[PDB]
């Protein structure tokens, strides 16, 4: 037999009646998420008791509830039933402090089935974290995924975490984003990974004060973990030099990184030449974000040349707010009409104007094009280039999602888009139009299109 139940409530005030009504589910569900449900320390006692009798629970998510240090304590006590098998557990944004880490530390030593922990959005501080690390070092701790974003951790937390990485051959992912662990801490965490036999799968250290020189530390990491799939280093003034010293690792034959997150890292056109060398060489690199980098029209030219050459197999290019202009659009049009690997192009917050957008539409409108997702939010688009978009939606049949949110679009422009998507021949499945001003007529006209074709979601 097989009985699997799941409940996942989010942002809902729960009455007492309704609460007792859900308690039987807490005793029965393998998957429970009460995200921002107003849970109180008090109510953490019903959960404690209910989970104590749930021989099924495998995933518990209590994100964004004021559980406090006492509440979390009551919830952790509920996981002490001998037959519990919780594999995932999130306590993100639960008002947990260093004063609660002792309890959690002594709790982790007794949950060998527990594999994932999210402590992000809590003020743990170095003492609490260091105290937890002691629990994690227990051989009974089989944690493989840990997220500590925004945990008030500084450089004084990396040696403790490095020791944990050394003690977990089974480790898969660590996230330390939004913690100023500085250049040394970053150098210390990477030291652990190097020694550690754990085949890391994803490393995230965004907004961590990662420095240019650290781009050398990370080099050793990329050129050492064939298992590494995701590397997130956004929001760090890495630099073009930083980019340069990363390539030796990426360009390593054994590197098989699939996702590289480098939005707002102090990269320009020169750093592009550096990344293009990696793109054209590594068919393993599929997703790339350079959002918020001053690539300029010269950066897009460089990226576009490589996207037009055999080799690079990039699938998603995220280049929103990169400071591109219409001058660099004739190239993307070609790629959208000559590329058979790119399915998504986030090119928001770029002054492409109607001239640039129209060029993009020309390439996607070419038979053979394959692009699936296009993001053109805040690209200074108006009704001008709207007829094109309307025809492109009838000519090209690969696009499934189009984002035109936050532009100048008019009622005459939308009407044109509508006259195209309302048709059975347009296969667009999702249109997103946040922050746009149409008439009360258009609204109903839009609300009609809904019912006439429910397979197309118009998000606004």
């Amino acid at each position: 037999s097989l009985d699997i139940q799941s409940l996942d409530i989010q942002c809902e005030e729960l009455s007492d009646a309704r609460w007792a009504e859900l308690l039987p589910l807490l005793q029965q569900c393998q998957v429970v998420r009460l995200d921002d449900c107003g849970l109180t320390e008090a109510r953490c006692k019903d959960i404690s008791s209910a989970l104590r009798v749930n021989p099924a629970l495998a995933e518990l998510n209590l994100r964004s509830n004021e559980l406090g240090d006492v509440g979390v304590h009551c919830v952790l006590q509920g996981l002490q039933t001998p037959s519990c098998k919780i594999q995932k557990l999130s306590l993100q944004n639960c008002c947990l402090t260093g004063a609660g880490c002792g309890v959690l530390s002594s709790t982790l030593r007794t949950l060998p089935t527990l594999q994932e922990l999210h402590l992000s959005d809590n003020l743990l501080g170095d003492a609490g974290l260091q105290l937890l690390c002691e629990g994690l070092l227990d051989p009974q701790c089989r944690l493989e995924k840990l997220q500590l974003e925004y945990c008030s951790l500084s450089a004084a937390s990396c040696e403790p975490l490095a020791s944990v990485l050394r003690a977990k051959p089974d480790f898969k992912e660590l996230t330390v984003s939004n913690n100023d662990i500085n250049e040394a801490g970053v150098r210390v965490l990477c030291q652990g990974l190097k020694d550690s036999p754990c085949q890391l799968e994803a490393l995230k250290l965004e907004s961590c004060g990662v420095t240019s020189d650290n781009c050398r530390d990370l080099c050793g990491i990329v050129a050492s973990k064939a298992s590494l799939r995701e590397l997130a280093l956004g929001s760090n003034k890495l630099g073009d030099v930083g980019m340069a010293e990363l390539c030796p690792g990426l360009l390593h034959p054994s590197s098989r990184l699939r996702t590289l997150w480098i939005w707002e890292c102090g990269i320009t056109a020169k750093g592009c030449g550096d990344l293009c060398r990696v793109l054209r060489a590594k068919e393993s690199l599929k997703e790339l974000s350079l959002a918020g980098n001053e690539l300029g029209d010269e950066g897009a030219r460089l990226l576009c040349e490589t996207l037009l050459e055999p080799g690079c197999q990039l699938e998603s290019l995220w280049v929103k707010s990169c400071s591109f202009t219409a001058a660099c659009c004739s190239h993307f049009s070609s790629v959208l009409a000559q590329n058979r690997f790119l399915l998504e192009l986030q090119i928001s917050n770029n002054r492409l104007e109607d001239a640039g957008v129209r060029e993009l539409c020309q390439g996607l409108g070419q038979p053979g094009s394959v692009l699936r997702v296009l993001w053109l939010a805040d690209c200074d688009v108006s009704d001008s280039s709207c007829s094109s978009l309307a025809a492109t939606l009838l000519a090209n049949h690969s696009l499934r999602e189009l984002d035109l949110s936050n532009n100048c679009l008019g009622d005459a422009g939308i009407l044109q888009l509508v006259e195209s998507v309302r048709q059975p021949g347009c296969l667009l499945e999702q249109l997103v139009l946040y922050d746009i001003y149409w008439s009360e007529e258009m609204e109903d006209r839009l609300q009609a299109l809904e019912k006439d074709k429910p397979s197309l979601r118009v998000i606004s």
Binding site: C11, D36, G234, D403, V432, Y434, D435, Y437
Partner: protein, 126 residues
Amino acid sequence: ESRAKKFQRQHMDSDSSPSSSSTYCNQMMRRRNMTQGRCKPVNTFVHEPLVDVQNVCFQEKVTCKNGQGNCYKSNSSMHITDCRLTNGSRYPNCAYRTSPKERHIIVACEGSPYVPVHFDASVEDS
């Protein structure tokens, strides 16, 4: 949902303190259903009584960003909070930067009774 309640949902939070915290936007954008299917890129909440935001519909007339002749700018700089999507956000993990401030608002109003039907922009003229 009418062309007025959605405004309250997406842009109204009257009784919320002005000095928003770093959880507000991540919290409010979630509670007000602006991160369903897709993360709403930018959104502004107004810390003023509905009647105060409603009067702007009769305050100074101005042109909307799109070019339609029928927007309005408030008389006073209202206490608002801007929510900005981080360039590291990946649905459904929408992430916002919360920015509280005092600025005049520019809304579009339509119908009968005449009411706000779109939050157009905020202005720093003081």
